[PDB]
């Protein structure tokens, strides 16, 4: 038993991290088959990022201006192209560590693991969520750009995130592996508005179910509610609205615990209106929204990968 | 910027996890050079666990009574031996994936990454602390035994923990890689008492320094205290005593932030008696004690490994 914020094992991703250098700028790239992917602002100086013309900056660059290093190995660059906000390098050698992989654009509220990297070398792994306003609250210092987020299904790595930007507010923004930003952000050093950040309601409910499975039950109440009644409360507390698709996803947890989804919504409603009275749930004094219903099921059945 | 509970990259350890079966009981083992390590209770049935005589139970067994699977390949056991509470299996093949490694017995309050495993396959990775009462609060379902905890220093994996036991209270207990239990626990399915758990004070202070570095400063004040009066308040709230060794450890964080250790303790003293109201620190409503001072420095300067 017990419940932890768990990341996927990162071995398959470590073998794809490389260092990309262009002039004075070095950041992380992703080496799969014979292509290397990296944020396009590798071609920028600090002064360029205030207002970069990426097409005009890239035209000054040839294949040999890009230094791609995998461990101690130099890769030979034999072609380059810009796809949205990522650069793709055709190299001499296919990565022999290439796992089975897919590229995926995830939805707000989904979770993924982040392998934070500096100079092509892994530093740490953690789990996090795509917020409803398409930012993530990560841990990224200077040089972490090009670090990637992923999920794993058995033997297949689903890449869903490449880090590009810290916003002046301190939250983080990036792209999918086709180089399209999540959200309205651009790769430019300017003030950029993220939306109001709301709480991922279906995830909070999944974690309440996890709590009941682990013996933590003080918040279960004598009330029920309706979807429309709950959503009126949800809107007041900046919770995302709950839909029947969400109720359906929670089905298996409902069946295991014997607690109907609308009954657990009434417990959540009462927690939103009355607070937690200084009490804790699964060791947390706040309502946690970084576990998907799938995350909760995985942890409570012990699903592996290798 | 940003601050997260990061685990070490787990690739070096994933390549050492095997599956060990003995009759009806399967758990995880660690394959280093030509040896597989695993908990000795793999030779127990559920009934045996109530009162095992391990020497007698092991004598009933021979080198071929053991069943070691690595991925799909079967390993050939040519020998076995019992070192304290671990079994040492001599196999035919040295693990070609053996990393540079060390066995280490850690101290209470130190932290490590756990690779949670089932049937020899990694499921997830998370960071945790050895509590002052020598338990850990992990996420361990049936079959996770033999999962290991580790740290990484550049290129050398320091193995410090192997999971053995879930206590009746739902916390976890295990050994070092020589098979000596942390704490007063034994590999027998009985009621077992763990000490009163205290909060790791030096870690809470480290995390407050992390919060300042990251722009969260509201809890600061121009009060003070000496070491001796802080400790009067410290327990009274079940906090571990602070020693000069601890003040010395926090020196570099003190120098980076311009906040004297004793002044940070005076901020903690104030926090313990009035709470945090509805206010948070680094997104948390409680005081966090699973970051060591070394953890904070690692994350804030971006130390890599590869």
Author numbering:
A (entry chain A), B (entry chain B): 1 to 306
The authors write:
SARS-CoV-2 Mpro is a cysteine protease that forms a dimer composed of two protomers. Each protomer comprises the chymotrypsin and 3C-like peptidase domains I and II (residues 10–99 and 100–182, respectively), with the active site consisting of a Cys145-His41 catalytic dyad located in the cleft between the two antiparallel-β-barrel domains. Mpro cleaves the polyproteins at 11 positions with a consensus cleavage sequence Leu Gln | (Ser, Ala, Gly) to release nsp’s, which are required to assemble the viral replication-transcription complex. In addition to the indispensable role in viral replication, SARS-CoV-2 Mpro also plays an essential role in escaping antiviral defense by cleaving host cell proteins.
Crystal structures of 11 Mpro mutants provided structural insight into their altered functionality. We employed crystallographic structural analysis together with a high fidelity FRET activity assay by our group to assess the functional and structural changes in Mpro mutants. The crystal structures of several variants revealed the changes in side chains orientations of residues in the active site comprising substrate binding pockets, especially S2 and S4, which might lead to altered amino acids preferences. Accordingly, changes in KM values for most of variants were observed, indicating alterations in a mode of substrate binding. We observe the highest level of conformational plasticity around the S2′ and S3′ binding pockets with N142 and S46 being the most flexible residues within the structures we solved. Also, we observed that the charge distribution in the active site changes quite dramatically even upon a single substitution especially around the S3′ and S2 binding pockets. This might explain why with most mutants we see the changes in binding affinities and not the kcat values.
